[PDB]
Amino acid sequence: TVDLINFRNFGIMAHIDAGKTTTSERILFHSGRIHKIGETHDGESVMDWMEQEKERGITITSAATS
Amino acid sequence: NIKSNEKRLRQNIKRNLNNKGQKTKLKTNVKNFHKEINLDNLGNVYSQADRLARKGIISTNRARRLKSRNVAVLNKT
Amino acid sequence: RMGRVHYPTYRIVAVDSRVKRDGKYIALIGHLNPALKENKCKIDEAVALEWLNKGAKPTDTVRSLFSQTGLWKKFVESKK
Amino acid sequence: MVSFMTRLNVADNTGAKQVGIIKVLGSTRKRYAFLGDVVVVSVKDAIPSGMVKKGQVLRAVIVRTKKGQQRKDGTHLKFDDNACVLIKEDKSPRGTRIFGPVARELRERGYNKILSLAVEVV
Amino acid sequence: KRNQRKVLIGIVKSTKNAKTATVQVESRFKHPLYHKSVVRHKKYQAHNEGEVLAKDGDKVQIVETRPLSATKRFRIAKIIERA
RNA sequence: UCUGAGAGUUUGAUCCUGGCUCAGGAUUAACGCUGGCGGCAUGCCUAAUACAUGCAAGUCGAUCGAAAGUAGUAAUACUUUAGAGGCGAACGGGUGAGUAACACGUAUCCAAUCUACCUUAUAAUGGGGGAUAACUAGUUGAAAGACUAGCUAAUACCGCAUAAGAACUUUGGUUCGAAUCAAAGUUGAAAGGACCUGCAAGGGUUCGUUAUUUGAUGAGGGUGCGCCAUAUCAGCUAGUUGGUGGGGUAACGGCCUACCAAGGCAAUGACGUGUAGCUAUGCUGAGAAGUAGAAUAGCCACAAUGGGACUGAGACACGGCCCAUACUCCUACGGGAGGCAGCAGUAGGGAAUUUUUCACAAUGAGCGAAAGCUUGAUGGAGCAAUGCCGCG
RNA sequence: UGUACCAUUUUGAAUAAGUGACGACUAACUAUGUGCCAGCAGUCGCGGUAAUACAUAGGUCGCAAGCGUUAUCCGGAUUU
Numbered sequence: 001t002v003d004l005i006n007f008r009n010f011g012i013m014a015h016i017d018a019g020k021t022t023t024s025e026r027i028l029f030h031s032g033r034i035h036k037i038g039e040t041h042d043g044e045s046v047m048d049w050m051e052q053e054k055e056r057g058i059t060i061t062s063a064a065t066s
Numbered sequence: 067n068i069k070s071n072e073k074r075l076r077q078n079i080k081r082n083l084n085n086k087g088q089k090t091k092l093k094t095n096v097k098n099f100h101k102e103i104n105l106d107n108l109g110n111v112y113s114q115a116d117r118l119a120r121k122g123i124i125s126t127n128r129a130r131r132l133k134s135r136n137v138a139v140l141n142k143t
Numbered sequence: 144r145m146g147r148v149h150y151p152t153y154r155i156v157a158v159d160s161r162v163k164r165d166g167k168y169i170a171l172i173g174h175l176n177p178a179l180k181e182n183k184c185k186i187d188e189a190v191a192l193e194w195l196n197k198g199a200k201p202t203d204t205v206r207s208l209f210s211q212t213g214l215w216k217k218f219v220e221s222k223k
Numbered sequence: 224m225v226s227f228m229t230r231l232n233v234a235d236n237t238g239a240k241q242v243g244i245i246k247v248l249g250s251t252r253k254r255y256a257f258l259g260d261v262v263v264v265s266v267k268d269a270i271p272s273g274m275v276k277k278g279q280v281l282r283a284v285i286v287r288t289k290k291g292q293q294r295k296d297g298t299h300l301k302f303d304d305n306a307c308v309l310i311k312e313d314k315s316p317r318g319t320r321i322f323g324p325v326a327r328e329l330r331e332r333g334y335n336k337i338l339s340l341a342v343e344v345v
Numbered sequence: 346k347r348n349q350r351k352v353l354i355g356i357v358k359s360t361k362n363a364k365t366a367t368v369q370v371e372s373r374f375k376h377p378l379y380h381k382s383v384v385r386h387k388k389y390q391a392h393n394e395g396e397v398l399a400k401d402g403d404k405v406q407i408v409e410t411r412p413l414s415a416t417k418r419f420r421i422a423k424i425i426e427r428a
Numbered sequence: 429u430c431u432g433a434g435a436g437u438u439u440g441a442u443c444c445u446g447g448c449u450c451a452g453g454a455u456u457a458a459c460g461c462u463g464g465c466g467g468c469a470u471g472c473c474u475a476a477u478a479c480a481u482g483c484a485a486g487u488c489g490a491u492c493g494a495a496a497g498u499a500g501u502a503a504u505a506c507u508u509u510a511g512a513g514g515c516g517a518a519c520g521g522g523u524g525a526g527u528a529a530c531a532c533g534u535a536u537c538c539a540a541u542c543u544a545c546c547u548u549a550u551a552a553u554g555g556g557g558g559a560u561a562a563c564u565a566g567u568u569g570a571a572a573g574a575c576u577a578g579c580u581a582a583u584a585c586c587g588c589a590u591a592a593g594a595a596c597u598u599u600g601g602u603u604c605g606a607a608u609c610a611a612a613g614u615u616g617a618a619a620g621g622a623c624c625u626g627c628a629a630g631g632g633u634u635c636g637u638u639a640u641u642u643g644a645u646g647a648g649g650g651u652g653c654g655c656c657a658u659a660u661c662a663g664c665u666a667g668u669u670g671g672u673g674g675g676g677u678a679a680c681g682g683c684c685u686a687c688c689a690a691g692g693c694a695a696u697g698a699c700g701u702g703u704a705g706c707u708a709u710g711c712u713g714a715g716a717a718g719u720a721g722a723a724u725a726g727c728c729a730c731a732a733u734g735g736g737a738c739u740g741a742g743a744c745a746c747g748g749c750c751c752a753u754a755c756u757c758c759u760a761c762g763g764g765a766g767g768c769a770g771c772a773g774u775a776g777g778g779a780a781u782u783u784u785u786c787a788c789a790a791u792g793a794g795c796g797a798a799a800g801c802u803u804g805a806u807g808g809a810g811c812a813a814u815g816c817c818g819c820g
Numbered sequence: 821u822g823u824a825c826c827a828u829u830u831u832g833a834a835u836a837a838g839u840g841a842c843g844a845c846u847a848a849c850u851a852u853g854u855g856c857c858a859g860c861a862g863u864c865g866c867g868g869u870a871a872u873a874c875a876u877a878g879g880u881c882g883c884a885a886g887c888g889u890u891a892u893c894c895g896g897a898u899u900u
Contacts, residue, residue, distance in 0.1 A: 038759055204790095410538095462887090
């Protein structure tokens with residue numbers, strides 16, 4: 001089974017207007033690559049690029065992505 | 067979602083195909099009797115009616131009614 | 144059963160398996176309180192055999208309650 | 224060709240019956256409609272049970288044309304009537320259920336929302 | 346047809362149709378709240394069985410049976426003929 | 429007999445006709461001020477508005493082949509079932525949107541219909557054939573799935589034989605639209621499992637199955653009677669009314685159809701409109717009756733709407749199918765899941781209607797010879813002084 | 821559910837009351853403020869100068885872990 005050393009937690013340490021959200025999106029996409037459910041072309045280029053910061057910054061903020 | 071629902075659906079698809087087949091076998095011999103009103107055709111029709119009634123495809127009352135209608139025509143001959 | 148909570152009172156009835164719980168019943172056998180350790184069912188044992196011979200077998204929980212009274216001892220021999 | 228003050232039917236969930244053109248969006252004095260051209264429209268008949276009201280001017284796009292235009296393939300599809308679909312302030316259309324088929328002459332131009340609600344695309 | 350007694354005696358009003366008659370039974374009863382003799386009139390449609398035919402202005406006996414036709418669920422049992 | 433209460437209010441003052449308010453019980457009550465408990469019931473009448481998620485019908489290996497794995501040299505023992513097939517699914521669960529008439533309440537007639545399993549005993553469970561999932565391979569494929577060819581068993585399917593008994597027809601007889609019975613013509617039933625015994629042969633216990641045959645039971649159909657307001661609603665009705673022939677649902681029936689027709693209902697008020705679940709029942713008074721038809725018990729129907737068919741014994745089927753319709757969600761944009769008036773719970777409404785609760789302990793249900801599996805039916809617990817009793 | 825319940829188990833008045841109303845109808849009143857202003861209220865009807873009709877204090881009366889309050893139904897209303 002899963003041992004206690006196998007649940008690693010990472011935090012994206014930065015402030016906004018630094019491309020931080022885009023790096024988080026890329027990490028979540030490539031790390032959350034799911035091919036059979038439909039995530040492929042729905043999160044391939046998920047864009048939080050700033051035209052209106054608030055919308056993306058609210059819809060994507062959460063507690064933790066696994 | 068009900069597993070028994072889809073199970074019985076896939077079962078009664080085949081059951082419906084078989085029932086339609088037997089119903090058409092019945093009706094084509096009923097037409098044959100309508101063409102040739104004789105004893106042999108009536109005997110075949112009643113044999114097939116009993117076959118359906120054996121499994122239960124046609125209720126005994128319906129079979130009795132239809133065979134009464136056919137035997138009346140044969141008796142008129 | 145029916146009655147107030149913390150007071151189980153199950154009236155003994157003949158049941159056909161198609162009927163809902165404590166709905167329109169065919170015929171009430173009698174009354175019995177499971178809490179009291181004493182036989183208290185009001186049964187005639189004649190109409191009971193009538194229902195047995197006309198089918199629609201009642202609850203199984205009372206079958207034992209009829210073995211104590213010897214209903215089986217006469218029912219199985221009246222079957223012959 | 225379809226033109227201004229041409230009342231045609233609607234092909235989505237609006238509750239309207241007829242709707243007329245008032246002006247073709249774009250450069251002035253174009254005066255000639257074509258497939259996929261966005262236009263300004265005014266409803267002609269509408270029931271309150273829908274989601275439109277009489278006398279209101281909105282924006283739509285013609286999808287099916289009685290005139291017919293020839294596609295770059297060289298195969299020319301036509302329709303026996305004119306059909307228009309209303310769009311709410313952007314590429315997203317107001318309606319959810321589309322009635323009748325559509326064409327592919329606007330696939331390269333976007334409008335994937337409309338085709339996502341269409342049964343057949345030519 | 347021999348079913349038990351069911352008396353529906355009345356006065357036949359019309360016999361325009363072939364072996365079909367509109368009979369009229371006039372029943373007097375008591376008010377459920379005041380108990381006074383109050384009369385009411387009910388129409389019935391009856392079929393003649395061949396062996397018995399209905400003539401206007403006579404007392405008859407009507408019984409229930411299998412429906413011969415729509416709204417025809419009764420038959421003529423006994424006829425008190427013209428008087 | 430159950431069982432009976434009045435006062436004030438007009439006037440300068442008096443009486444009389446009449447009205448109004450108060451004096452009391454009850455809630456599917458709530459608000460406002462406070463607030464201990466035990467016992468017990470009750471806790472969306474509004475949006476049958478839309479509603480995320482878990483449950484709300486599952487079960488059967490003593491039905492079958494096969495598949496996988498723990499032991500075992502393999503064989504085989506051991507654990508499960510993906511599928512087929514079987515039973516169950518139509519009942520429970522919930523609401524009153526809609527329904528003004530046999531729907532409801534009640535008695536008959538069904539010589540007008542059926543009922544798997546339960547109850548009645550009897551003939552039998554004879555011999556063959558063919559496929560088929562499961563499995564593999566190929567294709568369409570992101571999966572979802574779908575298409576194509578082989579592989580496999582059955583209490584699955586399909587011929588034939590026996591068919592006392594049954595259906596059908598004919599001859600005779602009983603009786604007042606049908607009864608019982610003698611002979612004849614015709615027709616059609618299946619399958620073995622599991623266990624024990626026996627060298628075998630064969631025999632036995634139970635189950636599964638067909639036929640026949642008794643009740644009980646459910647449903648359906650007709651019936652008299654009563655069962656809202658409304659005349660500031662006088663004509664309504666065209667398979668309608670009726671007949672002949674035929675077809676058709678369990679049956680009779682224009683139920684439907686071919687033909688012939690002209691009536692039928694109807695000032696004892698039809699038709700029209702509004703409203704409506706009904707009944708037993710809850711309250712009020714002694715009663716005439718009114719009030720409300722919480723829960724409950726039965727009956728009635730739909731399950732977002734309009735329709736249709738199938739399986740099944742029974743459904744046009746709470747969470748079956750398909751079609752059309754309004755929406756959500758996913759989609760790689762090709763197409764798909766569909767529908768909590770089930771338990772909950774939330775957005776909103778309102779005065780307000782609750783744990784996103786436990787176990788099926790008990791009953792029941794569904795199934796299986798069984799160990800028994802499921803059960804938000806069912807029984808407990810939680811919140812709230814909504815109400816009653818007791819209690820500090 | 822170690823629940824209910826029981827046994828001088830231990831300490832302990834200690835751990836728990838508010839509510840409406842008093843002119844009459846209909847048992848339950850006096851003081852201060854008050855000037856048709858405030859306000860009461862189911863009715864008669866109260867308050868523009870000693871207000872038992874109002875606001876408050878006290879007293880008093882009636883209910884009670886409930887009291888009032890409205891909606892609504894039967895009685896009184898035999899007032900279809």
